[PDB]
Each structure stands twice: as structure tokens, then as C-alpha cells.
Amino acid sequence: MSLKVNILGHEFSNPFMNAAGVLCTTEEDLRRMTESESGSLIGKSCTLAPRTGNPEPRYFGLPLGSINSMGLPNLGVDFYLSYAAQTHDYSRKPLFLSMSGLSVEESVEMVKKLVPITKEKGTILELNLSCPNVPGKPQVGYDFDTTRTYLQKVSEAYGLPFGVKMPPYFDIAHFDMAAAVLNDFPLVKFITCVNSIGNGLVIDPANETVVIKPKQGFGGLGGKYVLPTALANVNAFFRRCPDKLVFGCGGVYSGEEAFLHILAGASMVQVGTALHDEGPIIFARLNKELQEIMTNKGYKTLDEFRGRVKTM
Amino acid sequence: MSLKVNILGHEFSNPFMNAAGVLCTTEEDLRRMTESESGSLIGKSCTLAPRTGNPEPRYFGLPLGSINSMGLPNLGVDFYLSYAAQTHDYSRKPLFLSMSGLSVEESVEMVKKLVPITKEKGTILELNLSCPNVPGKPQVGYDFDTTRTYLQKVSEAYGLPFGVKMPPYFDIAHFDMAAAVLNDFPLVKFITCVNSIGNGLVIDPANETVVIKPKQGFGGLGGKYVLPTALANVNAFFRRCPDKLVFGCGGVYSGEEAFLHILAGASMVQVGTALHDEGPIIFARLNKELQEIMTNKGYKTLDEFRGRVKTM
Ligand SMILES: Cc1cc2c(cc1C)N(C[C@H](O)[C@H](O)[C@H](O)COP(=O)(O)O)c1[nH]c(=O)[nH]c(=O)c1N2
Ligand SMILES: Cc1cc2c(cc1C)N(C[C@H](O)[C@H](O)[C@H](O)COP(=O)(O)O)c1[nH]c(=O)[nH]c(=O)c1N2
Ligand SMILES: O=S([O-])[O-]
Numbered sequence: 223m224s225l226k227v228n229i230l231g232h233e234f235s236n237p238f239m240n241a242a243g244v245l246c247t248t249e250e251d252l253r254r255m256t257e258s259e260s261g262s263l264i265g266k267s268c269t270l271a272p273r274t275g276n277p278e279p280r281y282f283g284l285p286l287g288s289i290n291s292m293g294l295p296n297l298g299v300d301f302y303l304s305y306a307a308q309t310h311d312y313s314r315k316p317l318f319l320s321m322s323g324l325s326v327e328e329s330v331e332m333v334k335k336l337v338p339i340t341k342e343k344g345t346i347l348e349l350n351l352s353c354p355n356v357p358g359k360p361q362v363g364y365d366f367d368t369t370r371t372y373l374q375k376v377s378e379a380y381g382l383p384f385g386v387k388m389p390p391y392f393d394i395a396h397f398d399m400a401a402a403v404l405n406d407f408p409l410v411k412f413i414t415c416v417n418s419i420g421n422g423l424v425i426d427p428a429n430e431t432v433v434i435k436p437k438q439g440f441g442g443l444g445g446k447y448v449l450p451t452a453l454a455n456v457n458a459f460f461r462r463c464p465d466k467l468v469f470g471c472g473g474v475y476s477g478e479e480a481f482l483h484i485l486a487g488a489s490m491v492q493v494g495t496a497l498h499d500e501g502p503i504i505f506a507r508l509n510k511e512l513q514e515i516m517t518n519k520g521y522k523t524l525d526e527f528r529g530r531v532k533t534m
Numbered sequence: 535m536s537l538k539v540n541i542l543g544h545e546f547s548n549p550f551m552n553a554a555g556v557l558c559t560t561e562e563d564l565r566r567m568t569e570s571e572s573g574s575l576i577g578k579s580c581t582l583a584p585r586t587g588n589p590e591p592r593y594f595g596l597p598l599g600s601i602n603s604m605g606l607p608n609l610g611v612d613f614y615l616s617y618a619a620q621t622h623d624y625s626r627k628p629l630f631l632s633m634s635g636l637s638v639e640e641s642v643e644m645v646k647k648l649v650p651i652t653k654e655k656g657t658i659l660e661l662n663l664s665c666p667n668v669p670g671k672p673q674v675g676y677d678f679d680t681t682r683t684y685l686q687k688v689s690e691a692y693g694l695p696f697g698v699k700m701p702p703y704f705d706i707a708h709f710d711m712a713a714a715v716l717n718d719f720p721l722v723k724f725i726t727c728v729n730s731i732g733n734g735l736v737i738d739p740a741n742e743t744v745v746i747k748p749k750q751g752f753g754g755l756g757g758k759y760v761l762p763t764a765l766a767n768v769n770a771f772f773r774r775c776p777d778k779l780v781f782g783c784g785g786v787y788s789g790e791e792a793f794l795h796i797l798a799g800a801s802m803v804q805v806g807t808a809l810h811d812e813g814p815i816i817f818a819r820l821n822k823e824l825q826e827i828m829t830n831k832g833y834k835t836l837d838e839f840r841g842r843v844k845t846m
């Protein structure tokens with residue numbers, strides 16, 4: 223039996239990795255992800271210059287998941303590039319970097335710097351088009367003309383296969399429109415579905431007060447809230463973008479959810495809120511739980527069921 | 535304490551009503567809603583001609599809520615108009631009708647027929663701009679040009695105060711753009727936030743099959759999944775549309791969720807999934823639970839705390 227995944231020119235020991243933003247901001251974070259049983263890892267969504275992010279409190283754990291408005295705290299693109307070029311142990315597992323420049327001009331500058339490091343080390347880019355927690359910066363993926371510009375300019379500047387972190391869509395017409403844009407960019411080799419369900423609001427009934435400080439309490443939702451949305455997006459793009467991979471992100475707490483993501487079409491499975499809750503030991507648990515389901519169903523590889531969800 | 539709501543010249547006993555679609559399709563359904571302890575009720579979103587809706591199975595109750603793709607099964611506009619004109623007991627409570635024509639032309643033809651009945655009986659219109667379960671009909675509310683056309687044509691054709699059932703938004707820019715359109719239409723006196731989180735996907739791990747038949751398993755999500763989204767939408771439009779009321783819909787199972795909706799800005803509070811699960815006896819419980827919270831907090835009326843959620 224094998225959890226192995228062969229994509230983007232690498233063997234991954236298993237399909238599991240962190241969701242961008244979780245356990246991946248500092249060198250220590252990235253060390254712990256590398257030492258974990260995860261198949262891969264991804265660096266915190268970064269900007270050209272460092273950021274400290276939004277004021278506190280900006281994260282609140284919930285019974286059904288999480289709400290956050292972190293505000294893209296990151297050590298700046300040079301930190302993550304240097305991590306990728308010098309620090310990361312590629313013999314352990316491949317490395318992704320998430321990049322979230324807050325303009326096309328910023329993104330172009332950042333990805334340009336990545337080119338030599340991708341060529342030398344094999345570092346993979348996930349372009350973030352969906353951060354919902356930066357004041358005054360709308361989610362790029364909800365504007366298809368803006369999305370087209372980003373993909374055009376990053377395709378030109380970077381010139382190598384890369385992936386995109388998409389916001390969740392909730393409308394068939396939007397799946398169609400998103401896919402039409404994505405399918406015009408052959409360098410987009412993977413689509414990560416999904417980022418947080420944006421701009422939710424949690425209120426404490428006792429003190430009648432919102433639970434996070436930024437944006438009048440409005441924050442991105444993760445965890446159990448998002449699983450059906452995440453599965454839908456995965457499957458919608460799996461079908462609409464057959465020349466691309468899909469990575470699943472959203473609501474994974476166990477082997478069962480991972481199994482569903484993969485059945486829906488996911489090549490890799492990212493873990494955010496649950497990883498925030500449980501720490502990197504979760505990857506060992508997820509590997510075991512997924513294998514148990516496969517054992518019970520008589521599956522020996524992921525390929526026996528990836529993208530084989532049945533309809534009526 | 536008093537649960538009363540006084541809007542559009544009517545006295546409502548309490549803020550509670552069914553969400554459009556739940557317990558409101560047939561005469562018997564509407565009788566049961568009228569006989570319940572609810573403050574009001576709304577008829578099933580109707581079309582000019584009857585519809586049988588989508589094939590089966592099209593509804594699935596979930597641990598955390600519901601997924602459906604009913605497909606606007608309805609007895610046609612004449613049935614609901616005739617209910618509103620002849621059958622409904624207005625001494626029990628006021629009546630809303632939801633209308634969901636699948637074209638602006640259809641919606642116009644429908645609302646014109648309602649005009650005499652509103653004038654005579656006080657029947658209130660909720661225009662549905664958000665149904666996510668009709669194949670080939672995207673949610674109007676996610677296209678601001680189309681939304682503007684509907685509001686223009688319905689305002690002109692109906693010529694009386696009405697409300698709109700909006701899809702959930704997940705982006706600050708969309709709140710702004712939606713509000714800008716709504717604020718150009720003075721006859722829009724209330725905004726119901728929110729309709730289902732559109733186009734989620736639930737998969738059964740045992741048989742590796744989606745749980746509903748229409749649209750390859752894609753259906754609207756209700757229940758615990760939607761509470762933070764609903765609260766966010768309620769509060770965003772409460773602040774952006776001061777000339778209008780906001781009605782809350784989404785994730786209400788208890789007086790506590792009702793209290794949060796009202797604290798966020800809601801005038802009426804609609805109950806979908808929980809009502810589908812428990813039956814109309816739920817309304818007796820919700821009144822009791824909200825009364826308890828107000829008593830504990832020393833709130834004499836809903837007006838003392840409506841829209842007074844605290845931020846940091
Ligand atoms: C604390 C924290 C921080 C971030 C996030 C989440 C959380 C919880 N998310 C969203 C994340 O990548 C993921 O898409 C969602 O959390 C959904 O997955 P889960 O349901 O949480 O597993 C996120 N996404 C991204 O692309 N870049 C980022 O920097 C962040 N930051
Ligand atoms: C079976 C069923 C049928 C419908 C719905 C839901 C369900 C469960 N919903 C959506 C509903 O009005 C409501 O917006 C959502 O269900 C969210 O509220 P809850 O979280 O379920 O209370 C719905 N909404 C609407 O405006 N017109 C309709 O005809 C229907 N039909
Ligand atoms: O960094 S994001 O979570 O705001």
C-alpha cells in the first residue's frame with residue numbers, strides 16, 4: 223500500500239501538506255513542517271517587504287473551525303527565497319512558496335526573484351489570488367479581468383509552471399468564468415481550492431462583542447464550516463480544467479475528509495485549521511487514518527479512487 | 535419583555551418567520567405556519583407557471599445543516615396570490631410572498647398581479663434574487679448590472695414597498711457594490727440576508743457517491759454552516775443601507791442565534807433548516823429562548839439592542 227503522489231515531477235510520500243498561513247511563517251515553523259510526516263509544505267503567503275499583520279486579537283478558534291484576520295504577517299519575500307535556496311532539505315520533501323503581492327507590480331517583482339531558485343532547487347510557486355483579510359484589498363479571484371492580468375503578467379515574468387490559490391465560488395456561472403480564465407494560461411498547472419470563506423462574522427452573546435479586532439470583526443472562516451464548499455470547488459475545477467491539477471484545501475480533520483477531497487479530484491490535500499489546533503503530529507495521524515480507509519475498501523494506491531466520485 | 539416588531543405599519547408579535555422554501559409550498563404548509571407561534575410567514579418562492587422542480591433525491595439533512603437542490607417546486611403565482619387574497623388569516627399574522635421569476639419579464643408579470651392584493655390585504659413582497667438550484671439560472675445577486683435591471687423593472691411595475699432575498703457575499707467590495715445598487719431603489723425597504731451558501735457538495739464516503747441527484751451533487755447549504763456568513767451579511771447591509779431594514783436568515787436553531795442576528799441588525803429572523811428538522815413547534819421554543827436572553831440582559835425591547843453589536 224502507498225500514499226505516494228507523482229505530480230509536478232516529484233514523488234510525494236503522501237498527499238498531505240499545510241495550508242498556506244499555518245505553521246509556515248518562521249524558519250522554526252518550516253523546520254517543524256519539514257520534520258513532520260507531511261508529504262510537502264508551503265511557506266506563508268509573502269509580500270515584497272515584511273509585514274507584522276493586523277492588531278490583536280486576530281485569530282479565534284471555534285467549535286466548528288476558525289475565524290481569522292491575520293493580515294499577511296510575513297518575513298518578506300527575501301526570507302522565503304533564502305529559506306528555499308539554502309535552508310530547506312529537499313531530500314525530505316518538495317517545497318512550495320505562497321506569494322501574495324498586493325498588486326500585479328509587486329507580484330511580478332516577487333516571482334521574478336523566484337525564477338533562479340525554482341531552476342536550481344525545484345521550489346514550486348502557489349500564487350495567492352484570494353487573501354480576504356487585508357483592508358482595502360479585494361479578493362483578486364472575484365474579479366475575472368484582474369485575475370486575467372495577474373495570470374498574464376506572472377506567466378510572462380515567471381515563465382515556469384505554477385499554481386493558484388483561489389477563493390471559493392458559490393455559483394455555476396462563476397465556476398465557468400473562473401475556468402475560462404484559468405484555461406487560457408497553460409503555465410497554471412495546479413489550482414488550490416479553496417481559501418477561507420471570506421468576511422464571516424462571529425459574535426460573543428455574553429458580551430455582545432465581535433471576537434476579532436480587525437475589520438469590525440470580519441474574518442476568514444476555516445474548518446468544518448468550509449468542507450462542502452471546498453469539495454464543490456475541487457470537483458468543479460477538476461472537471462472544468464482537465465489539463466490542470468487540483469489541490470484540495472478546506473475542512474480536513476481526519477482521513478475521512480482527505481478521502482473525500484481525493485475522491486472529488488484532489489492531488490494534494492492541505493490542512494489549515496486542524497493543523498493549527500493539533501500541531502504537526504496531525505500528519506502522522508492523517509496518514510494512518512487514510513491508510514485505514516483504503517485498507518477497509520481494498521485500495522492499494524490513491525490512483526484507485528482519485529477523481530472517481532460517483533454521481534446519480 | 536416585548537418581542538414585538540413594528541414595520542411597514544404592521545405589528546408583528548415576535549421577529550420569527552419561516553425562511554422561504556421551508557413549510558410554505560402547499561395550502562396545508564401555510565396553514566401550519568399560520569397556526570404556529572411565528573410572528574409571520576412567507577410563501578414558497580413562486581414562478582408564473584407551476585414547477586415540479588428537480589429530480590430525486592434533492593434534499594439531505596446533515597449533522598451541521600442541510601443541502602438541497604429542490605429546483606423551485608411551486609404551485610404557480612396564481613395559487614399564492616389566491617392564498618394571499620382569500621385564504622390567509624391576517625388577524626393571526628402578516629403574510630409575505632416570495633417571488634422568483636427566472637427572467638426579469640417573468641418577475642414583472644408576477645409582481646403586477648400582486649399589486650391589488652398588497653393594497654387590499656397588506657401582503658408583502660420578497661423578491662428572490664438568489665436561488666442557486668435552477669440549472670442554467672445563475673444567482674442574479676452576483677451580477678450587479680442584472681440586479682439593477684430587476685430592481686428597476688420591479689420597482690416600476692410593483693410601485694409599492696418590497697424587499698429582496700440576497701445571496702451571501704464574501705468580499706468587502708461586493709458589500710459596497712451590492713449596497714450601492716440597493717441604495718438607488720427607495721422602494722426596497724428590506725434586505726433579507728442570506729439565502730443558501732450556493733453550490734456546496736456532500737459526498738458519502740461509504741458508497742463514494744454524492745447525496746443529491748441534480749447538478750452532479752451540487753446544492754445550497756443551510757444550517758450551522760451559514761451562521762457567521764449570515765451575521766456578516768446582516769451587519770454589513772445594516773450599516774451600509776440605513777434607509778432600509780435588514781432581515782436575518784441563516785443558522786438559527788435557538789434564541790441565542792436569533793439574539794445574535796438582531797444584535798447584528800435584523801428586524802425579522804427567518805428559520806429554514808432548523809424548522810425543516812423540528813417542525814413549526816420550533817417557534818414556541820424560539821420565542822421562549824429569546825425572551826429568556828432579553829430578561830437576563832435587562833433588554834425591554836428588541837429596539838434597545840438591534841444593530842448594537844460591539845466592535846473592538
Ligand atoms: C491562521 C491562518 C492563516 C492563514 C489562513 C488560514 C488560517 C487559519 N489562510 C487560509 C488557509 O490557507 C486555508 O485556505 C483555510 O484555512 C481553509 O482550510 P482549513 O479548513 O482551515 O483546513 C491563508 N491562506 C493563504 O493562501 N495564505 C495565508 O497566508 C493564509 N493565512
Ligand atoms: C428545503 C429548502 C428549500 C428552500 C430553501 C432552503 C431549504 C432548506 N431556501 C433557502 C432558505 O430560504 C434559507 O435562505 C437557507 O436555508 C438558510 O437559512 P437556514 O440556515 O437554513 O435557516 C430557499 N430560499 C428562497 O429564497 N426561496 C426558496 O424557495 C428556498 N427553498
Ligand atoms: O494572513 S491572512 O490570514 O490574513
Ligand SMILES: O=S([O-])[O-]
Pocket residue numbers: 555602603604605606607665666667668
Ligand atoms: O427551490 S430551491 O430550494 O431550489
